[PDB]
Every structure is written in structure tokens, then in C-alpha cells.
Structure 1
Amino acid sequence: AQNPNCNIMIFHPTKEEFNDFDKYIAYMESQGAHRAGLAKIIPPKEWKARETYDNISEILIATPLQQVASGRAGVFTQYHKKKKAMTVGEYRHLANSKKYQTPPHQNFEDLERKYWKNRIYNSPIYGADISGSLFDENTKQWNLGHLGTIQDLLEKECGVVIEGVNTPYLYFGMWKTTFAWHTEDMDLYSINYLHLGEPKTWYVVPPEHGQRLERLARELFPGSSRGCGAFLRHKVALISPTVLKENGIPFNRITQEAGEFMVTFPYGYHAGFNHGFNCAEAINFATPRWIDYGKMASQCSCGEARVTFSMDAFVRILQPERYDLWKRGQD
């Protein structure tokens, strides 16, 4: 069995290997990359996402989110307080202000220590989930707006044509902006490209061990767990690496830098934080191997998770027994 310890693997495809996206995902899986839940892909030196980032300041962040924490430093939830609209240029200035800027630090490990010690005492503002793309239309390789759609994959595997669309999303981050522990909708893959700026640190639980994380979360967030049998779908709970190690939960960590892709694999729980002002692009995708994960994915039906239009068909076709309850939670 490849990668039996479920380590995060790092790949360096050549320009020739960068042509066929699906083939390369399958290659990484042949080497056991999915066992980690997360892989890094460093593009060939010949590749670029676009020519420059000099002209992005007028992008609008319609609903910046202030991420307010509750709990203790290693075990907390965050809620998202909506803020007034601002441009990317305005947000960048805000990220660089004394109130929000990255502190002095020695290295990524010192900054990680500072994040976990201090995150709860601040409320950073995240420009998340903005429909759009920064790939040039002429970038033909690993262009996250030109991937095969999940609707087409389901149709190719299962024969059923479905409604829905699959487009990318932009994330503008600052120091301490945080992504809570989650798997993707319908336990899909995700791919994330860090276009510019400061790094993003990731934590990940191997898919084979995801239920260990779920059981810890139920213990640590006992009110939330009574509320909803899949409350990690709410994407609000954080657990630090120190707490995970104290509780024996298998996980790994890695820092993504500008110019690098990360891929999350079906049912790979992940969480993390941004180091400073940055911009990422991410989208969900599927492969044939996903279908069995999609059929078994948990679902939130309490009302909280509320998701895209295109999840309807995935539930309806892959999980018909759960569909009526789930759709009630959507309404």
C-alpha cells in the first residue's frame, strides 16, 4: 500500500505532465497521495497563472466577514459578522494596518505558535467565497475555471444528466483569518491556488481517520453536537494541533506559499490560517473515485449549513433516502 503513514506528499510535475489534469490526479493517487487528505503541487517553472497581479485592486469584496471567536485558545468557534463592502485595494490597506498586520516573527513555526496562542483575542476580516477567477483565459494548464465540471463527471459515471454549474471562488485573507475544520460539500475534492501574498498553513486528517476527528469534535463542542449530527458542516469549529496531539488524533500540517497548488481529497478534514494579506482561488472537483464518497457523505439537515444550488442534484441522485430531510433543512 502506498504512503501507509498518510504523509502529505509534494509533487513537481514537468510541463508535459501538467497538461492533463485528470491524469495527474490519478498519478498522485497511484503514489498514495490521497491517504494524507491533502497534497501540494508545485507547478513547472515554465507555467504561470496570469501575467501580473498589478490590476486587481478594483475587485469588490461585497461582504467581508469579521471572524469573531468564542472559547479557549485551542478549542473555539468562530462566527462571521458581515461588514460593509470594500475593494481589494481597500482590504489590502486594512490587512497591512497596525491593527491587522502580521507581527514580527522568526519563521513559520514561530508564527504558528503565535496564531494558536493569540488568535481568539482578535477578529480578523476575511474576503471569502467571492465568485470569480484570476487565471488568464490563455492559461491552458491547471486553470481552475476550465476544469471538467462535477455535473459532467456524475453524468459520465452514472449516466444521469443533472442541472447545476461549478465555478471558482476567490479568497482574500489577512493575518489570522481562519478556515474551520471541514470536509468539502458532498466530500468532494478541492483544489486551491495561492495567487499572491503571504502563506497559508494547513492542517489535515487522513480520510481513513476522519471519524476520529468527528468523535473528538462531538466531545469538545457538546451543545453543537446535540444541535446537529453533522455540525462540522457548519464550518465554525477550530481545534489546535496541540489539542489534537493530546487526544491522539492523526494529522499533518504544511504551509502553502504563493504559486503553489493544494489538493484536498474526498473526506480529508482540513483547517488552517493565513499569514498575512493574500489571495487564493479554489474550486471543488470530482473524479470516478469520488462517487463512493459522495454516496456516503454526511449531511447537515438542521438548517445551518445552507449551500449552493448545485448540491441539490448530488443529494437527490446519490442519496435519495436522505434527500427529503436534507431539502427541508435547505428551506
Structure 2
Amino acid sequence: AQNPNCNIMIFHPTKEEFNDFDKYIAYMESQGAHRAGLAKIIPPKEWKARETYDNISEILIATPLQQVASGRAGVFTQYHKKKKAMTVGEYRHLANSKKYQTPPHQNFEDLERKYWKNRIYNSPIYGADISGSLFDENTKQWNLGHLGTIQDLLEKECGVVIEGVNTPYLYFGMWKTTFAWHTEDMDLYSINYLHLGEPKTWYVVPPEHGQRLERLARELFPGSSRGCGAFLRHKVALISPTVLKENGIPFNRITQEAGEFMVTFPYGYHAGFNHGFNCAEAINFATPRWIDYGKMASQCSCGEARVTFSMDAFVRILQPERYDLWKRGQD
């Protein structure tokens, strides 16, 4: 078995290898990359997502989210308080202000220490989940707005045609903005490109060990666990690496820099934080190997997780027994 310790793998495709996205994903999996839950892909040196980022400041962040924490420094939840709209230029200036900017630090490890020590005492503002793309239409390789759609994959594998669309999302971050522990909707893959700015640190649990993380989360968030049988679908819980190590949960960590792709694999729980002002683009995707994970994906039916239009069909076709109750949650 390839990559039996489930280490995060880093790939350096050539420009020729960068042509066929599906083929490269399948290659990475042939080498065991999925066992980690997460892989990094460094694009060939010839490639670019677009010519410059000089003209992005007038993008609107219609609903910036203030991420307010509750709990202890290594075990907390976050809720999102909606703020008034602002442009990307306004948000950048905010991120760089004395109240929100990255503190002085020695290196990524020192910054990571400061994040876990101090995150809960601040409420950074995240421009998350903004439909759109920063890839130039002329970028033909690994263009996250031109990928094969999940509905087309389901149709090719299973023969059933379904409604729904699959488009990318932009994320504008600042120091301490945080993504809570989660897998993707329907335990899909994700791909994330860091277009510009400061790094993003990731933590990930190997898919084969995801249930160990779930069991710890039920112990650490006991009221949330009684409320919902899949409360990590709410995307609000944080657990630090120190706490994970204390409880024997297998995980790995890596820092993504501008110009790099990350791929998350089906049922790879991940969480992380931004180092400073940045912009990422991400989308879900599927492969033939996903289908069996999609059929088994947990679901939130308490009603909190409330998700896209296109997830309906995935539940309806892959999880017909659950359908009924899940749609009661969504309505």
C-alpha cells in the first residue's frame, strides 16, 4: 500500500502533466496521496492563473463575516456575525490595520503558536464563500472555473442525469481567519488555489481515521453532539493540534503559500487559518472513487447546516433513504 503513514504529499507536475486534470488526480492517488486527506500541488513554473492581480479591489464582499469564538484556547466554537458590505480594497485596508494585522513573528511555527494561544481573544473578519473566479478565461490548465462538473461525473458513473450546477468560490482572509473542522459536502473532494497574499495553514485527519476525530468532537462538544448526529457539518468547531496530540488523533499539518494548490480528498477532515490578507479560490469536484464516499456521507438533519441547491440531487440519488429526513432539515 502506498503512503501507509498517511503523510501529506507534495507534487511538482510538469507542464505536460498539467494538461489532464483527472489523469493527474488519479496519478496522485496511485502514489497514495489520498491517504493523508490533503495534498499540495505546485504548478509548473510556466503556468499562471492570470496576468496580474492589479484590478481586484472593486470585487464586493456583500456579507463579510466576523468570526467570534467561544470556549478555551484549544477547544472552541466560532459563530459568524454578519457585517456591512465592503469592497476587496476596503477589506485589504482593514486586514492591514493595526487592530487586525499579522503580529511580528519569527517564522511560520512561531505564528502558529501565536494563533493557538491567542485566536479566541480576537474576532477577525472573513470574506468567505463569494461565488466567482479569478482564473483568466484563457488559462486552460487547472482552471477551477472549467472543471468537469460533479453532476456530469455522477451521470457518467451512474447513468442518471440530474439538475444542479458546480461553480467556484472566493475567500478573502486576514490574520486569524479560521476554517473549522469539516469534510466537504457529500464528502466530495475540494481543490483550493491561493491566488495571492499571505499563507494558509492546514490541518488534516487521514480519511481512514475520520471517525476518531468525530468521537473526540462528540466528547469535546457534548451539547452540540446531542443536538445533531453530524454537527461537524455546521462548520463551527475548532480543536488545536496540541489537543489532538493529547487525545491520540492522527493528523498532519502543512502551510500553503500563494501560487500553490491544495486538494482535499473524500472524507478528509480539515481545519486551518490564514496568516494575513489573502485570496483563495476553491471548488468541489468528484472522481469515480468518490461515489462510494458520497453514498455513505453523514448528514446534518437538525437544520443548521443548510447547503446548496445542488446537494439535493446528490442526496436524492445516492442516499434515497436519508432523503426525506434531510430535506425536512433543509425546509
Shorter-normalised TM range: over 0.9
Give how far 1:161 is off. 0.1
Cα shift readout 1:282-321 (whole Å, capped 9, x = no counterpart)? 0000000000000000000000000000000000000000
1:60-102 C-alpha deviation (Å, 9 max, x unpaired): 0000000000000000000000000000000000000000000
* 1:196 corresponds to 2:196: yes
Question: d(CA) in 1 for partners of 2:163 and 2:295?
Answer: 18
Instruction: Give me the whole-angstrom Cα distance separating, in 1, the residues matched to 2:179 and 2:32.
Output: 25
Look up the SS of the partner of 1:127 in the other structure: strand
Distance of 1:73 and 1:312 partners within structure 2:
36
Whole-Å Cα distance in 1 between the matches of residues 303 and 123 of structure 2? 25
User: What's the offset of the Cα at 1:217?
Assistant: 0.0
Q: Structure 2 CA distance, aligned partners of 1:5 and 1:18?
A: 27
Q: Distance in 1 between matches of 2:54 and 2:117?
A: 35
Alignment gaps of 5+ in structure 2: none
1:155 partnered with 2:155: yes
SS in 1 for 2:291: helix
- Residue 126 of structure 1 and its aligned partner are, at CA, apart by 0.1
Structure 1's consecutive aligned runs of 4 or more residues displaced over 4 angstroms after TM superposition are: none
- Which residue matches 1:110? 110
Displacement of 1:229: 0.3
Structure 2 SS opposite 1:176: coil
* TM-score normalised by L of structure 1: 1.00
Counterpart-to-counterpart distance in 2, 1:329 and 1:18? 41
Report how far residue 232 of structure 1 moved.
0.1
2:67 is paired with a residue whose SS is: strand
Distance 1:124 1:227 in 2: 27
- 1:23-61 per-residue CA deviation (whole Å, 9 max, x = no partner) reads 000000000000000000000000000000000000000
Q: Matched residues in 2 for 1:199 and 1:304: separation?
A: 30
Residues 231-285 of structure 1, C-alpha deviations (whole Å, 9 max, x = no match): 0000000000000000000000000000000000000000000000000000000
Cα distance in 2 between the residues matched to 1:98 and 1:2: 47
Q: How many angstroms apart in 2 are the aligned matches of 1:54 and 1:41? A: 25
How far the C-alpha of 1:323 sits from its partner, in A, is 0.1
**Distance of 1:325 and 1:303 partners within structure 2:** 10
Residue 170 of structure 1 aligns to a residue whose secondary structure is strand
String of CA shifts for 1:177-201, please: whole Å, max 9, x gaps. 0000000000000000000000000
Name the counterpart of 1:74. Answer: 74
CA distance in 2, matches of 1:308, 1:86: 24
CA shift, 1:172, in A, is 0.1
Mapped to 2, the partners of 1:223 and 1:216 lie a distance apart of 13
Q: 1:144 deviation in Å?
A: 0.1
Q: Indicate the SS of the match to 1:271.
A: strand
The separation in 1 between residues aligned to 2:81 and 2:300, in whole angstroms, is 22
Q: Aligned to 1:172, what secondary structure does the other structure show?
A: strand
SS at match of 1:84: coil
State the match for 2:223 in structure 1: 223
Task: Give, in angstroms, the shift of residue 113 of structure 1.
Answer: 0.0
Q: Aligned equivalents of 2:9 and 2:119: distance in 1?
A: 28
TM-score calculated relative to the size of structure 2: 1.00
CA deviation string 1:3-37 (max 9, x = no partner) = 00000000000000000000000000000000000
CA deviation string 1:157-191 (max 9, x = no partner): 00000000000000000000000000000000000
Query: Which residue is 2:272 aligned to?
Result: 272
* Matched position secondary structure for 1:112: helix
Consecutive unaligned residues of structure 1, counting only runs of 5 or more, are: none
Distance 1:303 1:8 in 2: 34
